[PDB]
Design a protein around this ligand. Structure first.
Ligand code: SF4
Ligand code: SF4
Ligand code: SF4
Ligand code: FES
Ligand code: FES
Ligand code: CA
Lengths: 156, 146, 905
C-alpha cells in the first residue's frame, strides 16, 4: 500500500505549475518520491500517474528509462563510481577493486546491512580531476585506492 | 528576479521572460536536442526525425531553440562589445574564443579559453605541460568520447 | 509524381512515402516498424533504399523509404548492392538475440520476421555470443506474451496507445533491454487489444484462444465471412481445422473494418465449438428423444404442420436474410413474426426510417474517421459497436492531422503530426446513463437518463435551427454546455451524429434525427450513424413482420397451434415465464437452431441448423450494407452422422415437403432470387457477391492454402479410404485447394491473404490496389439504399424530464463487450473475461436503502425475484438502477423498464 505524503503532493503540484503540460513534471515527481523514500516503489508509479493525469505505463516507461530513478530498493548510501574513458585512463579499476574489497559486494548489489549500494555511472563531468565518484550528493575527485576505506567511514 | 532582470516588465521594456532550471535524471541521450525536448516534456528521451526541425515545431509543438551553455555565454560579449570586436578576436574562419583543454595523464589537466586556430600542441605542451613523467604520447581525441 | 526505381519509370501518388508507393507497385522492400494504418516512424531501419540526386548519379545515399516522400522526379534503387547489404545487416542484427523458437512459436508460418529474414537472403549466422532473454507477463485470457521474440519495432505501443487509445501498454527500459508490455501482470483493458496479434510482426503477442487448439496457417480452411457478434459487419476470415473453428482473422475491407476487429469479434467465436450443439434432427416422443435423418424429419414435420390449422414463424436478428425469408415463405407473410419485442422493433424501424428516408448520408465505418465533430446520443458505442468507437477516435485525432497538414507536414510523418497537435482534438460529445470508454477523448460527457439525453438532443437541434421544437426547463449550466456543443457542431465542416437502438429510447433516436436535420438545413456535410443490436437487425427490420408479443398472443389465445422458431432463444426479447407458458400451451413447437437453447425442452422437433461457420447467407449491417458470408467447412466431413444444414435449406425443404410431399433442398442463389423477387427493398443482396457460377479463368476460389497438409491422414483413423471431397453447390468457393487465390484475380471476396514471400498479414498489401486503401477490384458488399432526395420532418414529441418516483426504479442499461451479445456468452473463453454481474446504484439511493458496496439486494421483475451484489455508481442519476444487459437472467428488453420492491435480501 502506497500513499503520497502532503509535502510530496504539494511539491509535485508546484512542479506541474512550471510547465504548460502536467506530463512534463513526471521526471521531477519521480525524483521527489525518490528523494523522500530512497527509491520509487511500485505504488508510487500509480500515485504519480493519478496526480499527473497520465497513464501509469507512461510513468513506468519514464522511470525505467532513466538510470538515476531507482525502481528497486537501494541502500542508505549510493556510491556511483565513474567508469568512463578519462577515468579509465586515470585508473578507476583500482578504485572499483578497492570498493569491491571493502564492501564485499559486486556493482549493482547492496551491502548485507543495507548501508551501501555500489553502482557504475557515466562520466560525471569532472574528467580533469579523475578518477571521480559520487556518493549520495557529494562528488569526490583525485581518488586513490588507499583513500577509499578512509572515505567510506564518513558515511555512517 | 529580485533585481528585476527576470520576470515581468524587464527594465521597463515590457518583455516578459521566465527562466526555469530542469534537472535531469541521468541519461546520455538527453543531450541530443530533440531527445532533450522529449525529456523536457516528461517523455522517454527518444530523439525525433528532422524535418521538422525544433525551430518550426519543438517543445510542445511550439517554436523552440536549443543552444549550448557556451554559445549563450558567448552571446553577451557580442551584444556588449560589438560584432567587429568579436570578428577580430582570431584571424580564422571560426570567430571568437573557445574553451579548450587537455585531460588524462598530463602534467596540468585543466581548462582554458583560447582563440580558434590554436594548434593542439600548444594546448598539450604550453598549457597542460605535456605528458607526465615516464609516459610518452600515443593518441588523442580532440572533442570528447564521440 | 514520377519516380524511377532501378531504371524503371513509375507514376505514384506524391503524398505517399516511398515505401508504400513501391509496395503499391508490386516491389518488395523489407520493413518492420511501418504500418499503413499507423504511419512512419523510421525505427527498425529495415526499409533502406539508395536514393540518387539526379539520373546521372553513381554514389547515391541510403535513405529510409518509409520516411522519404515519393516526390516527382525521384531516383531510387532497391536492388542496389549496398542497400541489399544494409537490409541484410539489419535482419542479421535482429537475429542476434532472437530465440530458437520457430517450432514452438504460434507465429511460425505466419511470421513477418520469418518472411523478411528469407527475403533479405540472410541464412548464415556468424554471431556466437549470448542472446538476451526476458520474462513474460500474464496479459489475460486472450493475448499470450513472449518478449524473447521482440525485435523492438514499436508497432504494438504505437497501435495500442496512439491508434487504439489504450493506456495499460507501454515500452519500458533502455538500450537493448526495451520491454513491451504492461506495468504489471493483468488483463489488457482495451476492447481492441486483439489486433496486437496481427500488428506485432513477431510471436510476442499471440492468440491464446487459437494457441489452445493450435494449427499452422497452411493447415487452415478459410472462408470470407461476416462477424456475427454485433451490427457493424466487420469482414472476417474464419479458419477451421479438424472440424472445429480454430481462428478468426481480420479480413481486409477497405470500406468497413480495414485492418482491425474488436475483441468480441476476434475471441467470441467459441460457441461454434461447443459440444452441446445439435448435430442431428431430434424428435421428442413422450420422454424419448429419437434421432432422425433429414428426410424423416422433413416428412414428419410436414405431416404434423399440414395437420395444423395455423402455423406461425418467429424469426431472429441472428439469422441471415435468406433463412428469415424462407421461414416467412413457409408460414406466410401474415403469419411471420420478427422475434424481437415491440419496443425494440419500433426503435429499429425508426432507425431504419431515419437511415433511408432522412435525406442524410450514412457513412461506412472507414468513412467515419474523416469527420470533424462527433455527437453520440445514448449509445455506449465501445460496448455495442466497438469498431465505430475506434473510428471515432481516429476522427477525433483528425484535428491534429489538419493542424500538421497546415504546416506542410506529410500525413505519414505521424510523430511530427502528434508533436504539432499536442492535446488539441476534434470535438466529441457523448451522452449516456453513466461513464463511457470514450470519456478520455470526449470534449464533454453527459451522464443522464435517456429522457434527459433525448431532451439535450432536442435542445441542441432547436439551438441549431429554431424551426425545431424547443425544450422548456433547461438549467443555465446545461444551457451553457448545450451552447458549447452547438458552437462546436455549427463550426464543423463534417459533423457526425451517432445514435442507436441500444439506449432503449425512441426519443433519443428522434433527437439525433432532429440534430442531423438541423445540421443539414445549415448546409453542413452531416452524417448520421445508427448502431443496431445484432448482425442482421437491419435486415429483419427491412423484411418486417409482427413483434414477439403478437406471436405469443397468438400462441396463448389458441389461434396458432404450431410455431416454428428460427435461431431465437426468445428469452432476450420477452419474459421467460410468458414464453414458457405460450410454448407449453402450443401443441407443436419446432426450433431450427444451432445452439442448445432453453426453449428446446418444450420443442416437439429440433432442427440442427448450421452456425455462420457452416452456412452461407447474407446479413445487413448497421449502415445498410448487404454482405455475403460463406461456409467455412463441411460439418459432415469428419462426423458422417452429422446432419447440420443451413436454416434456409431446412425451411425451404420443409415448405416443399408441406406443399408437394417431396423433398427439394434448394440452391443458395435460388433463395437469393426469391428474396429479390418477393421483397424489392432487399433487391441489393443479389449483388453482394457473385453467384455459384463465378469463376476466375474457369476455376473456383480456393478455401485452403496450396500447402494444405494431411489430406490422406486427417480422417485415416475413421477409415483408411479417403472420403469424397465436399461439394459446394451453393457458392463459388471450393472445399479444397484446387482453386484460385491469386492477389491479381478479378474478385472481391478474399478468403485469406497469402503471396509468395509474404506469409504474414502483410500479404494484404499484395491484395490491395494501393497499400492501406481498398481491395484491388473493389471492396465486397453493396449498400441497400441511397441517400434520400428529401428528408423527414422534425419530431415534435419532446419528452418530459426524468422524475424519480417512489417504489419504482428505472433500469439503466449497462452494456458489456464481453457478455451482452447472446452467442459470445456461450464461448468458454468469455466467462473468465465477463465481469461478475452486479447492480449499479447511486450513492444517495444506496444510502437511502441502507446498502453498501457488495451487499446482495433482491428485486422482482415479472414476478421473479433475483439477487445481485451492489456497486456504487457515482455517475448514475438517482432514481435509476443499473443493470448489465444481455447477461444470464437479464434480458436486453429490460432497458427502459421499471423495477419494484428492490430491497436488501
Ligand atoms: S516470432 Fe517468427 S522468427 Fe521468431 S520464433 Fe516465432 S516464427 Fe520464428
Ligand atoms: S512486441 Fe511486437 S509489435 Fe511490439 S515492438 Fe516488439 S516486435 Fe514490435
Ligand atoms: S465491432 Fe461488432 S462486427 Fe466488428 S468485430 Fe466487434 S462484434 Fe464483430
Ligand atoms: S570520464 Fe569520469 S568524470 Fe568524465
Ligand atoms: S519501415 Fe522504415 S525504418 Fe522501419
Ligand atoms: Ca453451403
Amino acid at each position: 500500500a502506497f500513499e503520497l505524503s502532503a509535502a510530496e503532493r504539494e511539491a509535485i503540484e508546484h512542479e506541474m505549475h512550471h510547465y504548460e503540460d502536467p506530463r512534463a513534471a513526471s521526471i521531477e515527481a519521480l525524483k521527489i518520491v525518490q528523494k523522500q523514500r530512497g527509491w520509487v516503489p511500485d505504488g508510487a508509479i500509480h500515485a504519480i500517474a493519478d496526480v499527473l493525469g497520465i497513464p501509469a505505463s507512461d510513468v513506468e516507461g519514464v522511470a525505467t528509462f532513466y538510470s538515476q530513478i531507482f525502481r528497486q530498493p537501494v541502500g542508505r548510501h549510493v556510491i556511483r563510481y565513474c567508469d568512463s574513458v578519462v577515468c579509465h585512463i586515470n585508473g578507476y579499476q583500482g578504485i572499483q577493486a578497492a570498493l569491491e574489497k571493502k564492501l564485499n559486494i559486486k556493482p549493482g548489489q547492496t551491502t548485507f546491512d543495507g548501508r551501501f549500494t555500489l553502482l557504475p555511472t557515466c562520466c560525471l563531468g569532472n574528467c580533469d580531476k579523475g578518477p571521480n565518484m559520487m556518493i549520495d550528493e557529494d562528488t569526490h575527485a583525485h581518488l586513490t585506492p588507499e583513500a577509499i576505506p578512509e572515505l567510506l567511514e564518513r558515511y555512517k | 528576479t529580485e533585481a528585476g532582470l527576470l520576470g515581468k516588465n524587464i527594465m521597463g521594456t515590457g518583455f516578459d521572460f521566465e527562466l526555469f532550471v530542469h534537472t535531469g535524471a541521468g541519461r546520455y541521450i538527453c543531450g541530443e536536442e530533440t531527445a532533450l525536448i522529449n525529456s523536457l516534456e516528461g517523455r522517454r528521451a527518444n530523439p525525433r526525425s528532422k524535418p521538422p526541425f525544433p525551430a518550426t515545431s519543438g517543445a510542445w509543438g511550439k517554436p523552440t531553440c536549443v543552444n549550448n551553455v557556451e554559445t549563450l555565454c558567448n552571446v553577451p560579449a557580442i551584444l556588449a562589445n560589438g560584432v567587429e570586436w568579436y570578428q577580430n578576436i582570431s584571424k580564422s574562419k571560426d570567430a571568437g574564443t573557445k574553451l579548450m583543454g587537455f585531460s588524462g595523464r598530463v602534467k596540468n589537466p585543466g581548462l582554458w579559453e583560447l582563440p580558434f586556430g590554436t594548434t593542439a600542441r600548444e594546448i598539450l605542451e604550453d598549457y597542460a605541460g605535456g605528458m607526465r613523467d615516464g609516459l610518452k604520447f600515443k593518441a588523442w581525441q580532440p572533442g570528447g568520447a564521440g | 509524381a514520377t519516380i524511377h526505381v532501378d531504371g524503371k519509370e513509375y507514376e505514384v501518388n506524391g503524398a505517399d512515402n516511398l515505401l508504400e508507393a513501391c509496395l503499391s507497385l508490386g516491389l518488395d522492400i523489407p520493413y518492420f516498424c511501418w504500418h499503413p494504418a499507423l504511419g512512419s516512424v523510421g525505427a527498425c531501419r529495415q526499409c533502406a533504399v539508395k536514393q540518387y540526386q539526379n539520373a546521372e548519379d553513381t554514389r547515391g545515399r541510403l535513405v529510409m523509404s518509409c520516411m522519404t516522400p515519393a516526390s516527382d522526379g525521384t531516383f531510387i534503387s532497391i536492388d542496389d548492392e549496398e542497400a541489399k547489404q544494409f537490409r541484410e545487416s539489419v535482419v542479421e542484427w535482429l537475429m542476434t538475440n532472437h530465440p530458437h523458437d520457430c517450432p514452438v512459436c504460434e507465429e511460425g508460418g505466419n511470421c513477418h520476421l520469418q518472411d523478411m529474414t528469407v527475403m533479405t537472403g540472410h541464412s548464415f549466422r556468424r554471431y556466437r555470443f549470448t542472446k538476451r532473454t526476458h520474462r513474460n507477463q500474464d496479459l489475460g485470457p486472450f493475448i499470450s506474451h513472449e518478449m524473447n521474440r521482440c525485435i523492438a519495432c514499436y508497432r504494438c505501443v504505437r497501435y495500442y496507445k496512439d491508434y487504439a487509445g489504450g493506456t495499460d501498454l507501454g515500452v519500458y527500459g533502455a538500450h537493448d533491454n526495451v520491454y513491451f508490455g504492461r506495468p504489471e501482470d493483468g488483463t489488457l483493458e482495451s476492447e481492441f487489444s486483439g489486433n496486437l496479434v496481427e500488428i506485432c510482426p513477431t510471436g510476442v503477442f499471440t492468440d491464446k484462444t487459437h494457441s489452445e487448439r493450435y494449427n499452422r496457417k497452411w493447415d487452415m480452411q478459410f472462408a470470407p465471412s461476416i462477424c456475427q457478434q454485433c451490427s457493424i459487419g466487420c469482414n472476417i476470415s474464419p479458419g477451421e481445422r479438424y472440424g472445429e473453428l480454430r481462428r478468426i482473422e481480420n479480413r481486409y475491407n477497405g470500406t468497413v473494418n480495414h485492418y482491425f476487429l474488436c475483441d468480441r469479434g476476434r475471441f467470441g467465436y467459441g460457441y461454434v465449438n461447443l459440444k452441446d450443439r445439435p448435430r442431428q434432427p431430434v424428435q421428442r416422443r413422450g420422454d424419448d428423444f429419437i434421432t432422425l435423418n433429414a428426410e424423416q424429419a422433413m416428412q414428419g414435420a410436414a405431416d404434423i404442420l399440414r395437420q395444423s390449422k395455423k402455423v406461425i414463424g418467429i424469426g431472429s436478428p441472428r439469422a441471415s436474410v435468406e433463412s428469415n425469408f424462407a421461414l416467412r415463405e413457409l408460414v406466410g407473410e401474415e403469419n411471420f413474426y420478427t422475434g424481437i419485442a415491440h419496443g425494440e422493433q419500433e426503435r429499429l424501424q425508426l432507425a431504419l426510417k431515419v437511415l433511408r428516408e432522412g435525406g442524410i448520408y450514412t457513412p461506412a465505418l472507414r468513412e467515419i474517421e474523416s469527420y470533424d465533430a462527433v455527437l453520440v446520443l445514448g449509445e455506449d458505442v465501445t460496448q455495442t459497436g466497438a469498431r465505430v468507437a475506434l473510428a471515432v477516435r481516429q476522427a477525433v485525432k483528425g484535428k491534429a492531422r489538419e493542424m500538421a497538414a497546415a504546416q506542410k507536414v506529410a500525413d505519414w510523418q505521424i510523430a511530427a503530426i502528434l508533436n504539432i497537435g499536442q492535446r488539441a482534438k476534434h470535438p466529441l460529445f457523448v451522452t449516456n446513463v453513466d461513464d463511457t470508454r470514450l470519456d478520455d477523448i470526449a470534449a464533454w460527457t453527459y451522464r443522464a437518463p435517456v429522457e434527459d439525453q433525448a431532451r439535450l438532443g432536442f435542445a441542441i437541434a432547436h439551438a441549431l435551427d429554431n424551426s425545431a421544437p424547443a425544450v422548456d426547463g433547461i438549467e443555465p449550466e446545461l444551457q451553457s454546455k448545450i451552447d458549447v456543443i452547438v458552437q462546436a457542431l455549427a463550426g464543423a465542416k463534417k459533423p457526425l451524429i451517432i445514435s442507436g437502438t441500444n439506449a432503449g429510447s425512441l426519443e433519443v433516436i428522434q433527437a439525433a434525427a432532429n440534430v442531423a436535420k438541423a445540421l443539414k438545413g445549415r448546409g453542413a456535410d452531416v452524417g448520421i450513424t445508427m448502431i443496431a443490436r445484432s448482425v442482421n437487425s437491419m435486415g429483419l427490420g427491412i423484411m418486417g413482420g409482427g413483434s414477439l408479443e403478437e406471436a405469443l398472443t397468438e400462441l396463448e389465445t389458441g389461434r396458432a397451434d404450431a410455431v416454428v422458431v428460427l435461431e431465437n432463444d426468445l428469452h432476450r426479447h420477452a419474459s421467460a415465464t410468458r414464453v414458457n407458458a405460450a410454448l407449453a400451451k402450443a401443441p407443436l413447437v419446432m426450433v431450427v437452431d444451432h445452439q442448445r437453447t432453453a426453449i428446446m425442452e418444450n420443442a416437439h422437433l429440433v432442427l440442427s441448423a448450421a452456425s455462420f461457420a457452416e452456412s452461407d447467407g447474407t446479413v445487413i449491417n448497421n449502415e445498410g450494407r448487404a454482405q455475403r458470408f460463406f461456409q467455412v467447412y463441411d460439418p459432415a466431413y469428419y462426423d458422417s452422422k452429422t446432419v447440420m444444414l443451413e436454416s434456409w435449406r431446412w425451411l425451404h425443404s420443409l415448405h416443399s415437403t408441406l406443399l408437394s410431399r417431396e423433398v427439394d433442398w434448394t440452391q443458395l442463389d435460388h433463395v437469393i432470387d426469391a428474396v429479390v423477387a418477393k421483397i424489392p427493398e432487399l433487391a441489393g443482396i443479389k449483388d453482394a457477391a457473385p453467384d455459384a457460377t463465378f469463376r476466375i479463368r474457369g476455376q473456383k476460389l480456393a478455401r485452403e492454402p496450396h500447402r494444405y497438409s494431411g489430406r490422406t491422414a486427417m480422417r485415416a483413423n475413421i477409415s483408411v479410404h479417403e472420403p469424397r471431397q465436399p461439394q459446394d453447390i451453393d457458392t463459388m468457393f471450393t472445399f479444397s485447394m484446387e482453386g484460385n487465390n491469386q492477389p491479381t484475380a478479378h474478385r472481391s471476396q478474399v478468403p485469406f491473404a497469402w503471396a509468395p514471400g509474404w506469409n504474414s498479414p502483410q500479404a494484404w498489401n499484395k491484395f490491395q490496389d494501393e497499400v492501406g486503401g481498398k481491395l484491388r477490384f473493389g471492396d465486397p458488399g453493396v449498400r441497400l439504399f441511397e441517400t434520400s432526395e428529401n428528408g423527414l420532418d422534425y419530431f415534435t414529441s419532446v419528452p418530459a424530464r426524468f422524475q424519480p418516483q417512489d417504489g419504482k426504479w428505472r433500469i439503466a442499461p449497462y452494456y458489456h463487450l464481453f457478455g451482452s451479445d447472446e452467442l459470445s456468452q456461450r464461448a468458454p473463453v468469455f466467462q473468465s473475461r465477463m465481469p461478475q454481474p452486479y447492480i449499479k446504484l447511486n450513492p444517495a439511493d444506496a444510502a437511502k436503502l441502507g446498502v453498501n458496496a457488495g451487499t446482495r439486494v433482491s428485486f422482482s421483475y415479472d414476478g421473479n425475484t433475483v439477487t445481485l451484489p451492489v456497486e456504487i455508481a457515482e455517475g448514475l442519476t438517482a432514481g435509476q438502477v443499473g443493470l448489465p444487459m444481455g447477461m444470464s437472467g437479464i434480458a436486453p428488453v429490460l432497458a427502459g423498464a421499471h423495477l419494484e420492491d428492490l430491497k436488501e435480501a
